[PDB]
């Protein structure tokens, strides 16, 4: 039997305004939650979440084939070898059911210093043509910026939270800079379902991905009405209800390591449904030379020996680590 993990409804709407009382209750409950599973749902957010799944579903429906390999990542075209994170990542029928297009800040253009220098996990955006797909770019730009307002406000409760200014995590996360990315993932209805496509895990239970952390500051993820995520306690993997009009939240690897696990990064896996349905994730990473300086909210000095970690190695170190553990998406 399998039990339901405790992810609470926070309002956040406070984050966004000047009742600093009002972000401190935020705060409160957002610290609550990162010290019990890990996990909770942001609601009043302001973001319109219809037409976020609208767009992406006219959009991997009407993609062809033609056009997932001239947008694929180099894993499926060697032509490409620029693309190691942005494009299309197709599914492989009878062996790999997900496919997904992955889209980075959209200032990063030919004239950004980090293209020019061609430093890693930087690249500039690939897109489908604008007749075959008219306002997906639009709509897919618009959205980045759209759920980066949220996290940064999302930021500004989690800085509170562990008792610093509401700017400590904010001031890194720049539009000019910013390595977060978009993912609009597509997990099809199959009959019959490829057993290849489905991992089974210690403990039995079918998966479509396997345990990890996130490779990220925090996650930010939108995903259709349908159950699949799982995060994992001390009494075992606790199913994560779906709730397709809230955002779901959860720390990331550098969180943990920056607050010496304080706020863990939940480990959690995707249960196999055989469903359609979306989940569009929005991975806040800061920029490739940001640092932050570890501390332990548990010790008064609030003193850590652990060594500070600039954010770009940590994020080429950990999206090749996560592909390698958990398979090529
Ligand atoms: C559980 C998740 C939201 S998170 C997990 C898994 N995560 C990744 O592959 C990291 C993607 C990083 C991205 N290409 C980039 O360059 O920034 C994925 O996809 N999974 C999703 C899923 O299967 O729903
Ligand atoms: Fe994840």
């Known amino acids: 039997s399998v039990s339901k993990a405790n992810v609470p409804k926070i309002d ?86 997900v496919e997904s297009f992955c889209y980075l800040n959209p200032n990063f253009t030919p004239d950004h210093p980090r293209i020019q220098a061609k430093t890693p996990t930087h690249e500039v955006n690939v897109w489908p043509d604008e007749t075959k797909h008219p306002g997906f770019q639009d709509f897919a730009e618009q959205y980045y910026w759209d759920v980066f307002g949220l996290s940064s406000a999302l930021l500004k409760g989690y800085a509170l939270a562990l008792g610093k200014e509401e700017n400590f995590f904010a001031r890194h996360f720049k539009p000019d800079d910013t390595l977060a990315s978009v993912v609009l993932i597509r997990y099809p209805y199959l009959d019959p379902y490829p057993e290849a496509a489905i991992k089974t895990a210690a403990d039995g239970t079918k998966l479509s991905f396997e345990w990890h952390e996130d490779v990220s500051l925090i996650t930010v993820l939108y995903q259709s009405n349908v159950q699949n995520l799982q995060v994992e306690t001390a009494a075992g993997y606790q199913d994560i209800e779906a709730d397709d009009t809230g955002y779901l939240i959860d720390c990331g690897s550098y969180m943990a390591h920056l607050t010496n696990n304080y706020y863990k990064a939940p480990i959690h896996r995707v249960k196999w449904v055989n469903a359609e349905r979306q989940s569009l994730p929005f991975f806040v990473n800061l920029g490739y030379d940001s640092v932050i300086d570890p501390f332990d909210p548990r010790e008064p000095n609030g003193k850590s020996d652990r060594e500070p970690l600039s954010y770009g190695d940590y994020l080429q170190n950990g999206l090749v680590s996560l592909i390698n553990k958990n398979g090529q998406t």
Not at 54 to 76: G, V
């Open 12 to 97: 956040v709407s406070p984050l966004f305004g000047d009742d600093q009382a009002a972000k401190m209750r935020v705060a409160q409950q957002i610290d609550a939650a990162s010290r019990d599973t890990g996990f909770f749902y942001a609601v009043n957010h302001g973001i319109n979440v219809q037409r976020l799944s609208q767009k992406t579903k006219e959009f991997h429906m009407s993609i062809t084939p033609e056009e997932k390999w001239d947008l694929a990542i180099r894993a499926y075209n060697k032509e490409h070898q620029d693309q190691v994170r942005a494009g299309y990542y197709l599914s492989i029928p009878g062996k790999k059911a």
